[model samples]
Target: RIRRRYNMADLLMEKLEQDLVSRVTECLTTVKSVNKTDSQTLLTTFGSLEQLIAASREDLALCPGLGPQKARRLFDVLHEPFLKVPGGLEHHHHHH
Candidate 1:
């Protein structure tokens, strides 16, 4: 989970969309394994962060340009906790 605050409430740009798709695009491209081209397909395919985050390791591998290694790595990075407390690595499961 994360919390964010945006600045400049006065300025409004209609052309600019600070939507999830844009955020998701930035996120997909942020990963080194996923390049610029792959980011487009990945974003288009995944669309929402909810589905993308919950997508299984095997499922992610099925996408074009995402092979075994890249898929696994992406899954690994996706599921990893950004904050590691004093305790061990606690897992968050979404497995059905």
Candidate 2:
């Protein structure tokens, strides 16, 4: 289960509207594999377009299952914006 702050059973049920809640649950259950599920989490937690695009390639390369190419792709997907920012990486990517 998704660990979250405590909830009152009745209050939780009350807030979960059937249609909206059902759709999310259905999508979560439909994710077919571990990598796909992880990708979804990456998308969800960092939904900000800029942040997602700002992900790092060299970092992904260090993960256990990821190879150099996959890591670069993942980093490219997330770090694209920083590449465009004026003095972005040169100025802002690394900071004090």
Candidate 3:
């Protein structure tokens, strides 16, 4: 049953405490890193989205279910393969 009374029960709004889970829950759903179940321990591991984002790369690869699977996946995802094609790979040196 639901409550809409002036002085009902303390259980009326039983989950307002730390209710920001809705916001972060959406965050988990949006991101490819964490899932519903993983999100629990994931968030429990860090403090917030900022905390998770700014977390240590090593820690992330080792924490939660971030074992070899996530280790490699997250590793590749985090890695930047931006091989800069600086000036078409031409050398601008002086006399040979």
lDDT of candidate 3 over 36-61, digit per residue (tens): 66656556676477765565566666
Which TM-score value belongs to model 3?
0.45
Model 1: per-residue Cα lDDT over 1-96, one tens digit each: 434234454234422555555677788777778776666777667777677778876767777756666667778778766652323436644432
Q: Compared with the true structure, what per-residue lDDT tens digits does model 2 show for residues 1-96?
A: 766535686566667655544444343333233245444444455433344345555543444453456555565444445445444445565432
Q: By lDDT, is 1 or 2 better?
A: 1
Off by over 4 Å in 2: 1-6, 9-55, 81-96
Q: What TM-score, over all chains together, does every model reach?
A: 0.61, 0.31, 0.45
**Local distance difference test, candidate 1:** 0.66
What residue pairs are clashing in model 3? Answer: none
The residue-level lDDT of candidate 2 at 41 comes to 49
Q: Please tell me which model should have the higher lDDT, number 1 or number 3.
A: 1
